[PDB]
């Protein structure tokens, strides 16, 4: 039976069949419920819309993300989304196909406990597993060593690995990701006048960000150049033809990745986070982590991010050494690609949590058998 | 049993059977009484006349409209109109038939309350319903989405709808319609000495308005042209042989719809009201309302009005949009046709207010079981 | 030289001198112009009227508000109102006095840019300063640690301030204020038949609101009480001579504050906004923010709103905390009184913006020498 690799990301749900090389389907993880009053008798049915249907019709809906910082907060929505992805997207019976999920490190235990409980008692999947995301990212690159910086929609996390051996005492999780960047872009935009408030309008600010934002290579220089002239301005068209124009916002918003004091946070930037992640590990493996940075996750698709991080980390690490910022072209999907790779292995097929094992031991097994 | 549709307008009662595509009865909504002595013997009885039997004898009658501005102001006579419709036009005792009525939006509660009270207590219909006029207008075109502009005889109101979900904060009503324009035409006809002072002469002026008037496409150019030439003047023959000739009145009277300050009202024209109603809707759907602007009501029957709405909304709205005014050729009965379609839904048979329910809860039930 | 303090309200301009106890002059911020034509020579002159004189004659004027939601939309008329204050109400040439102004938070930048440019180029004030309204609101009360819930005529906003160190990432600004409550009241007064359809009658609805609206401590309970008994029905006398009776509108009108979905808005009520603004702050400072909720703004004078806010917030904050609301009688002028306090301090004299500094650096200096 061909396994399934369901990466229940925090912003987008990626899914597909093991043995493939790209997800069968992608779509946002939003459950929309109508907000106004229905007058047309015999029309306006389907009290709730999920996925792309609620994405397009968002004018009359309220968009709820069930995942808030990588931690599933509302469960009824999550069950809804899993049923949707299994049936109306993949179009297969879950009770015959192994599944492989993904989770962030340092998550509350009840999260994955209930994840497995749902998978086994609602969908009756024959087998399932819960892998960490950076390990799959490091498979997707095809490596055994490296330090993985996977920044999704909810969470940012470093996870140094060396020759297959993870070093949990240096894993660092920094809860600052794409969603916060959009919520700060929305707030800065008012300086020009534009007011984006409703839940739906976050999905227009998100597109503005995805379309126009780029991380600076020298923040001070970019501010100076922007102030000098309008060379950096770019105009965007709302869904009402009205055109908006943003200048230095384009690189002020991503800057928050490196100076979380923009959003008020105390944590340090991602460059210092990765550096301090390297320093905590054993001194004799630092050489192969300094030289094997491997990015992942969507948030790392801003132009100029790689050069900026190269410069910023090299301004920290000892000069004689070499820092190499590997950025796979499809890093937006590395976790799922690695999941497919893992589910392909013959050696791995002895590590499944089978329905008999779950029935014998109970939900708590998923902690023992899973990293 | 078969239901009845009774679109009790302010100018014309349109009553018939659900299923047909036309009203079975169409008579004016007036109730006349004699203002002269009755020296004849055994002749001139029936102190009051109703409908066309009143119109044909308007020589010796005083005409009254039981409905004014869409709020019923004389129930003793609206009862006579209902009695006439049921018993002489459709020729059916209502006690057997479900009855479907209509009321304009923002129209006081104590109006439909007393309408329900009358229908249940006096005629004793098995069940009934009060559907808003814009919504039926929207069914008649079979659409799902658009901004409905009804311009009846006494009220002009908009009701934006997207995918079936109405927006109560964008329902803008403008009580300027056919009777205001009839009175204004009577006012400006005095410039040429034509003095129409009574009610019968108001009916004659209403026929003048229907027969001659048309909406200008550029008011200042039309005024200059008419003032500089006789290309526009037209004639009409009164019911005693005298012949009248009118000029720029023809397009001055309709223009009041786009400039109510012609009659002292401060509100905005119909174009501005439509734009404001759309612009109170969510940004997500304005692209779909711009291209689905419906029309209805008798007063929008002027030749070239659709072109003027096109021009005004095109000038007002953002340049990157497709304005398209939907003007069905049969749009004089659009509300009634929509009602006929609505009453013939199997899903709508659960929406009727049944006699037992009103006996239980009372007139206020209409505020619950009806829009 | 006594430095004025000109609080720029959206609905009421509050002006006076620094050091006083309360404003020397108060007058509404509207600019009116007649719509009809003059017929008698030497009468009905001076096409434009401003403020209270426009209020007095509003029967023949069209009334425009230069400010919308706190953002000066009509500069040509705000200039006239500033001229009016300086040269008729206070009756002092401004170029002899430092002039302290105010501005709401999260307010677009070009707004205060031009607000400074006009002040320095038309009136040529020797100095000036543009404070925030929450900081002044907290000055007036003499505290140092509070979260001001300032509800005005254009903007409702919270601002947590602790020991004088603001938290710029927690400030919230909602575009719901007195004017929307007035508009919703004017709409729901059509449920009874009263039609208020002119810019002149917006002020009659405004006074009906100010004089008969009150907030319910338990919305559903008050609705039941109103339906069951007429004890909540009170009558009012319109200037035209008529009389009106209003039942449950009296509290249905201010309820838009706590369930903004009544006016089609999605955002959360004021109590939820305050709770969120307190939950976005550091952990250890919430204890003192809970205990110093300082109210302000005219919209907050609705009887029963302090109690309502305290009752509602105590259901969100953990039971162990001592939620307090401070509702001084003079909370309407709080911002101006705070400005009067600020201008008199001896430590403030250095942070003025002087004519020479503006000349050397232009309007951009406002973002640098203020908050
Ligand atoms: N081309 C892009 N440029 C910038 N940001 C992007 C791009 N694509 C996706 N993102 C960001 O990535 C987030 C969603 O994608 P993703 O990182 O993969 O979430 P997740 O892994 O949890 O499924 C969004 O916050 C979005 O801002
Ligand atoms: N061809 C026409 N041209 C101009 N005005 C018209 C035309 N037909 C009807 N009207 C006007 O519309 C009014 C009646 O239209 P109607 O839709 O039936 O009003 P109601 O809301 O009561 O149903 C009349 O007063 C008449 O003046
Ligand atoms: N006692 C009151 N009760 C209720 N509303 C009031 C009261 N006083 C003023 N208002 C309303 O608040 C607004 C004026 O108050 P204000 O705080 O000064 O607005 P702004 O800050 O913009 O100057 C007006 O819309 C008015 O209707
Ligand atoms: Mg991810
Ligand atoms: Mg009509
Ligand atoms: Mg204020």
Numbering used by the authors:
A (entry chain C), B (entry chain A), C (entry chain B): 5 to 375
Show passages lifted from the paper.
ATP-hydrolysis-coupled actin polymerization is a fundamental mechanism of cellular force generation. Actin polymerization powers fundamental cellular processes, including cell migration, organelle dynamics and endocytosis. After incorporation into F-actin, subunits rapidly hydrolyse bound ATP in seconds. F-actin polymerization is coupled to the G-to-F transition, a substantial flattening of the actin subunit that renders its nucleotide cleft active site competent for hydrolysis.
Reasoning that continuous conformational flexibility was limiting the resolution of the 16-protomer reconstruction, we focused on the central 7 subunits. Focused refinement substantially improved the resolution of both bent F-actin reconstructions (ADP–F-actin, 3.6 Å; ADP-Pi–F-actin, 3.7 Å), facilitating direct atomic model building and refinement. To examine the internal deformations of individual subunits, we superimposed each protomer with a subunit from its nucleotide-state-matched helically symmetric model and examined subdomain-averaged Cα displacements. This revealed complex displacement patterns that were dependent on a protomer’s strand membership and lattice position, primarily characterized by subunit shearing around the nucleotide cleft. Although subdomain displacement patterns were highly similar between ADP and ADP-Pi, the shearing magnitude was greater in ADP, consistent with the higher overall average curvature of bent ADP segments and enhanced deformability of ADP subunits. To identify specific structural elements experiencing deformations, we once again performed per-residue strain pseudoenergy analysis, which is insensitive to rigid-body displacements. This revealed three primary sites of strain: the H-plug (Extended Data Fig. 8a (left)), the D-loop (Extended Data Fig. 8a (right)) and the nucleotide cleft. Notably, bent ADP–F-actin displayed significantly higher total strain in residues adjacent to the nucleotide (7.5 Å distance cut-off) compared with bent ADP-Pi–F-actin or the straight ADP–F-actin controls. Consistently, solvent-accessible volume measurements also revealed expanded nucleotide clefts in the bent ADP–F-actin protomers relative to bent ADP-Pi–F-actin and straight ADP–F-actin controls. We also examined detailed rearrangements within the subunits (Supplementary Discussion and Supplementary Videos 5 and 6). These were broadly consistent with actin’s nucleotide cleft functioning as a deformable locus that coordinates mechanical rearrangements, the rigidity of which is dependent on phosphate occupancy.
